Amino acid sequence: KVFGRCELAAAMKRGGLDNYRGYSLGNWVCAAKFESNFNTQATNRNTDGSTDYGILQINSRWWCNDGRTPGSRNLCNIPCSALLSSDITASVNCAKKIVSDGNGMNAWVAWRNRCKGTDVQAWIRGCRL
């Protein structure tokens, strides 16, 4: 499913992401935009053999099991395919663990390079939240 900006903001908010670990909602919507272009089915393979899955491009080396990443830790205890669902709950629950891991949102490279320090408020402007 390809989410709309405001539609995604509402789902993430309902999911408990607004200001989770101090990160406002605009941060999360911005990261999703640049990581997957709001597409739940996005996947991207990395050079180390791991793959990134879903709306927030969660990596198979640490967070989910895809059965083809040797040394995977599956810290979110979930098959990576569950992260591609139209219901973002799994991605949301796993993202909470990732952001709490010590490096905050810097764990998402597109956030660090394209969202961090920008007016992220623009991402939820106009939305009825």
PDB file of N, CA and C in Angstrom, residues 12 17 28 31-33 35-36 39 52-59 83 91-92 95 98 105 108:
ATOM      1  N   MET A  12       0.567   6.739  12.084  1.00  0.00           N
ATOM      2  CA  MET A  12       1.729   6.745  12.958  1.00  0.00           C
ATOM      3  C   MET A  12       1.357   7.354  14.292  1.00  0.00           C
ATOM      4  N   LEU A  17       3.677   7.104  17.745  1.00  0.00           N
ATOM      5  CA  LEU A  17       4.965   7.652  17.339  1.00  0.00           C
ATOM      6  C   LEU A  17       5.174   9.159  17.564  1.00  0.00           C
ATOM      7  N   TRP A  28       9.100  11.330  11.643  1.00  0.00           N
ATOM      8  CA  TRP A  28       8.706   9.989  11.203  1.00  0.00           C
ATOM      9  C   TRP A  28       8.123   9.973   9.799  1.00  0.00           C
ATOM     10  N   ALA A  31      11.055  10.605   7.384  1.00  0.00           N
ATOM     11  CA  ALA A  31      11.882   9.413   7.249  1.00  0.00           C
ATOM     12  C   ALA A  31      11.203   8.381   6.340  1.00  0.00           C
ATOM     13  N   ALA A  32       9.898   8.167   6.517  1.00  0.00           N
ATOM     14  CA  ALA A  32       9.170   7.220   5.676  1.00  0.00           C
ATOM     15  C   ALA A  32       9.219   7.664   4.209  1.00  0.00           C
ATOM     16  N   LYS A  33       9.019   8.955   3.963  1.00  0.00           N
ATOM     17  CA  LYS A  33       9.069   9.514   2.608  1.00  0.00           C
ATOM     18  C   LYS A  33      10.370   9.179   1.913  1.00  0.00           C
ATOM     19  N   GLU A  35      12.725   7.028   2.887  1.00  0.00           N
ATOM     20  CA  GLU A  35      13.163   5.650   2.973  1.00  0.00           C
ATOM     21  C   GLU A  35      12.419   4.766   1.987  1.00  0.00           C
ATOM     22  N   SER A  36      11.115   4.965   1.869  1.00  0.00           N
ATOM     23  CA  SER A  36      10.319   4.101   1.015  1.00  0.00           C
ATOM     24  C   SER A  36       9.353   4.803   0.091  1.00  0.00           C
ATOM     25  N   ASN A  39       5.740   3.694   0.614  1.00  0.00           N
ATOM     26  CA  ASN A  39       5.336   2.382   0.101  1.00  0.00           C
ATOM     27  C   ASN A  39       5.733   1.258   1.075  1.00  0.00           C
ATOM     28  N   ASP A  52      16.532  -4.384   3.372  1.00  0.00           N
ATOM     29  CA  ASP A  52      15.723  -3.427   4.122  1.00  0.00           C
ATOM     30  C   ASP A  52      14.273  -3.617   3.675  1.00  0.00           C
ATOM     31  N   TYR A  53      13.364  -3.605   4.648  1.00  0.00           N
ATOM     32  CA  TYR A  53      11.950  -3.859   4.392  1.00  0.00           C
ATOM     33  C   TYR A  53      10.940  -2.828   4.867  1.00  0.00           C
ATOM     34  N   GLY A  54       9.983  -2.570   3.996  1.00  0.00           N
ATOM     35  CA  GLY A  54       8.885  -1.692   4.319  1.00  0.00           C
ATOM     36  C   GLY A  54       9.028  -0.205   4.337  1.00  0.00           C
ATOM     37  N   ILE A  55       7.963   0.399   4.847  1.00  0.00           N
ATOM     38  CA  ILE A  55       7.781   1.830   4.982  1.00  0.00           C
ATOM     39  C   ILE A  55       8.971   2.512   5.663  1.00  0.00           C
ATOM     40  N   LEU A  56       9.569   1.851   6.649  1.00  0.00           N
ATOM     41  CA  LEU A  56      10.702   2.442   7.349  1.00  0.00           C
ATOM     42  C   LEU A  56      12.031   1.753   7.081  1.00  0.00           C
ATOM     43  N   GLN A  57      12.054   0.895   6.054  1.00  0.00           N
ATOM     44  CA  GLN A  57      13.260   0.184   5.613  1.00  0.00           C
ATOM     45  C   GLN A  57      14.088  -0.468   6.725  1.00  0.00           C
ATOM     46  N   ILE A  58      13.426  -1.292   7.527  1.00  0.00           N
ATOM     47  CA  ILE A  58      14.067  -1.979   8.631  1.00  0.00           C
ATOM     48  C   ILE A  58      14.961  -3.129   8.139  1.00  0.00           C
ATOM     49  N   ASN A  59      16.195  -3.135   8.630  1.00  0.00           N
ATOM     50  CA  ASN A  59      17.209  -4.101   8.227  1.00  0.00           C
ATOM     51  C   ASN A  59      17.129  -5.517   8.809  1.00  0.00           C
ATOM     52  N   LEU A  83       6.691  -6.811   7.809  1.00  0.00           N
ATOM     53  CA  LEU A  83       6.953  -5.378   7.717  1.00  0.00           C
ATOM     54  C   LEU A  83       6.478  -4.761   6.403  1.00  0.00           C
ATOM     55  N   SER A  91       5.739  -2.524  11.719  1.00  0.00           N
ATOM     56  CA  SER A  91       6.829  -1.585  11.417  1.00  0.00           C
ATOM     57  C   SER A  91       6.918  -0.570  12.534  1.00  0.00           C
ATOM     58  N   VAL A  92       5.763  -0.103  12.991  1.00  0.00           N
ATOM     59  CA  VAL A  92       5.707   0.868  14.079  1.00  0.00           C
ATOM     60  C   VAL A  92       6.288   0.299  15.389  1.00  0.00           C
ATOM     61  N   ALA A  95      10.074  -0.136  14.972  1.00  0.00           N
ATOM     62  CA  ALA A  95      10.731   1.163  14.944  1.00  0.00           C
ATOM     63  C   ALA A  95      10.918   1.736  16.363  1.00  0.00           C
ATOM     64  N   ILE A  98      14.067   0.150  17.689  1.00  0.00           N
ATOM     65  CA  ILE A  98      15.222   0.688  16.974  1.00  0.00           C
ATOM     66  C   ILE A  98      15.585   2.081  17.498  1.00  0.00           C
ATOM     67  N   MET A 105      17.070   8.430  15.970  1.00  0.00           N
ATOM     68  CA  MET A 105      16.712   8.339  14.559  1.00  0.00           C
ATOM     69  C   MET A 105      17.859   8.313  13.556  1.00  0.00           C
ATOM     70  N   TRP A 108      18.375   5.656  10.932  1.00  0.00           N
ATOM     71  CA  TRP A 108      17.840   5.725   9.573  1.00  0.00           C
ATOM     72  C   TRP A 108      18.676   6.749   8.818  1.00  0.00           C
TER      73      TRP A 108
END
